[PDB]
């Protein structure tokens, strides 16, 4: 049974790196991360900031989600993020990504008890 929280850290973190390692990186993470076992997944970003900082947005602007909930945050500073973007070529179950890093605040869905990331709904 993975958590809502433990899903959201497989997804969408990556402290290790500072930045998008290298022009591999969404190819080697979006498999590793098991997020092309079943279908590429399109889109996804990973964060390279420490799980107690990506945590503390929950506790920081508070924002519509994308879907209309409430729950979403803005983080008040920047933070290290690469965005991971499927190929037109890319053909399961060989998925192909560009590896794009990034600055910009992070917006994130917030639940539970402790109140913890999980999801990461956009870039700003």
Do not use: W
């Not at 997804?11 to 079943?38: E, F, G, P, V, W």
């Not at 964060?47 to 519509?64: F, I, R, T, Y």
Request: hydrophobic share 25%.
């Amino acid at each position: 049974k993975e958590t809502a929280a433990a899903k959201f850290e497989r997804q969408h973190m990556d402290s290790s790196t500072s930045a998008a390692s290298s022009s591999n990186y969404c190819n080697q993470m979006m498999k590793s991360r098991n997020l092309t076992k079943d279908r590429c997944k399109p889109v996804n970003t990973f964060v390279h900031e420490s799980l107690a900082d990506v945590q503390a947005v929950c506790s920081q602007k508070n924002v519509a989600c994308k879907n209309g909930q409430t729950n979403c945050y803005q983080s008040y500073s920047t933070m290290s993020i690469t965005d991971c973007r499927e190929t037109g070529s890319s053909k399961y179950p060989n998925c192909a990504y560009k590896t794009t890093q990034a600055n910009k605040h992070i917006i994130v869905a917030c639940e539970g008890n402790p109140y913890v990331p999980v999801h990461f709904d956009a870039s700003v």
